[PDB]
Amino acid sequence: ADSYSEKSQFCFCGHVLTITQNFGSRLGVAARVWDAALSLCNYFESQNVDFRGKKVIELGAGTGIVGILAALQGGDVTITDLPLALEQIQGNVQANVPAGGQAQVRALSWGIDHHVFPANYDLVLGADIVYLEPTFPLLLGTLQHLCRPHGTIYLASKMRKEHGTESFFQHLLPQHFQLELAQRDEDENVNIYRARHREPRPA
Numbered sequence: 046a047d048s049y050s051e052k053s054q055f056c057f058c059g060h061v062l063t064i065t066q067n068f069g070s071r072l073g074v075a076a077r078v079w080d081a082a083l084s085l086c087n088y089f090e091s092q093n094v095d096f097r098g099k100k101v102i103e104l105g106a107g108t109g110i111v112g113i114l115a116a117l118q119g120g121d122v123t124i125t126d127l128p129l130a131l132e133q134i135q136g137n138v139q140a141n142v143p144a145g146g147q148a149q150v151r152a153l154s155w156g157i158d159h160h161v162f163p164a165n166y167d168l169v170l171g172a173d174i175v176y177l178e179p180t181f182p183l184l185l186g187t188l189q190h191l192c193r194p195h196g197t198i199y200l201a202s203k204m205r206k207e208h209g210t211e212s213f214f215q216h217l218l219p220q221h222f223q224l225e226l227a228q229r230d231e232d233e234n235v236n237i238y239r240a241r242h243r244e245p246r247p248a
């Protein structure tokens with residue numbers, strides 16, 4: 046069969062997001078909009094998360110949907126994935142982000158390419174990116190590097206114990222991050238975590 050695309054339509058925060066998913070062309074999981082992405086976008090809407098002027102990076106963006114919403118909300122956004130997904134992401138940026146929006150696309154293979162990015166992002170985003178246990182230390186170190194001292198990380202995941210999500214969120218991440226369960230969507234079984242660099246306590 047020919048490769049083909051499917052469009053999925055969304056309206057978040059009053060903006061149109063028309064997201065192309067490129068199937069049959071060997072993107073694998075990067076082609077799909079997964080469930081925690083929708084949850085995270087709905088949370089940015091419901092909580093009126095402020096992106097205006099903030100320096101934002103998305104990891105494992107897939108289609109780019111979350112980072113696109115951040116850019117529509119006024120963020121200065123860098124949307125990243127492996128090289129295989131970047132053309133898809135770029136298409137979705139071109140389709141959705143207006144002239145005054147800021148959304149660049151770059152490769153960032155976790156724990157390999159993080160040192161060609163600065164260490165000064167205000168917001169670091171990841172939806173459906175906690176699923177490959179052998180990658181966990183690479184992701185951890187990437188998060189550490191990107192998030193500026195007073196920055197915030199948002200991670201949204203469908204909870205699946207057999208892929209290591211509890212290990213990640215309940216063992217690895219809390220060691221050096223102050224971690225909040227920002228929201229649990231019981232129906233979707235998606236948790237949204239907010240993380241900040243762990244602070245030594247003064248007393």
Ligand SMILES: Nc1ncnc2c1ncn2[C@@H]1O[C@H](CSCC[C@H](N)C(=O)O)[C@@H](O)[C@H]1O
Nearest residue numbers: 075078079082105106107127154155172173
């Ligand atoms: N080592 C790695 N470095 C960078 N991105 C990676 C990676 N391993 C997996 N990914 C990316 O992580 C994504 C997981 S699928 C989730 C895509 C999207 N954020 C969504 O929630 O819908 C894929 O696009 C995949 O290519």
